[PDB]
Amino acid sequence: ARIAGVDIPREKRVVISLTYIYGIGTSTAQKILEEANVSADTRVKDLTDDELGRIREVVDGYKVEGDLRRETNLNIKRLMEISSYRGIRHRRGLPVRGQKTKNNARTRKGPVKTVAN
Amino acid sequence: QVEYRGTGRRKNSVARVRLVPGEGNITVNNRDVREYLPFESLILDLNQPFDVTETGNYDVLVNVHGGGFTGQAQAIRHGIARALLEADPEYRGSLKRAGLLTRDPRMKERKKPGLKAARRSPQFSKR
């Protein structure tokens, strides 16, 4: 069922359906399913209500998705106000990591603007 | 106690054959051939020498190294064929027609300079 303030797909397995929460991937899902002693092969449809609260109790130790938005965006918003190198690359809309911008910056550049002379 | 031996080479793999009279079950590298080879279709062509000469009462013990499982099994039939000719010279004519006696000379070709493989060329451009 619903856990940690987010809706969960019910038909799938627990260790896959916990990766639908922003902040939990394939490793930190199993790192809850190994300490709380819940069988990893259970369906989310077929839990009881005791094992649901046991998983839900330890999840709030890890950062929820509401925390991670203001934690990640504050790491970007302090980079722009100090006028760093990659602070202004966030403003330009260009790749941060130093990729060659001759041909492919298309994830940041977006759609194409075809001209020639 | 009489024991006929043959050597069989195919595709960077060589074989050493010791055959004893007994039940017709192949032994290779001190194991059984069920786990040693993934496909039973290979067993049909390494039992091809016993088919054409019509005999049997032969228990073969093989020792191979090098190559992969096609060349390391289709070289075993080369050793079986050259050891059955040590048992009877008259058996040669039945082995000659199928071609089990001869060795395949097909080995891997050389990567030439300028080409990505032996016979593979880079893509051509504005002509």
Binding site: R78, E81, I82, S83, S84, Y85, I88 | -
Partner: protein
Amino acid sequence: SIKKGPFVDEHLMKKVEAQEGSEKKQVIKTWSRRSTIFPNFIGHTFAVYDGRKHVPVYVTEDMVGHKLGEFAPTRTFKGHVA
């Protein structure tokens, strides 16, 4: 990245502690862009060599662990048409 202490250049750090005796004046010239900004570096305004000239740069209390050179941009890009 380096697990060793953030990179000290012996000439740069010498004259930063030679500023905390009487007064924090506003200009020291430096050619070190590879020097990590220490927590002692704050309050002093440097002059890095952009290339053409030394450009001004101030350090606030949000610059620890950042290089001295990344605040000065070396190549300038104006718009392709505007």
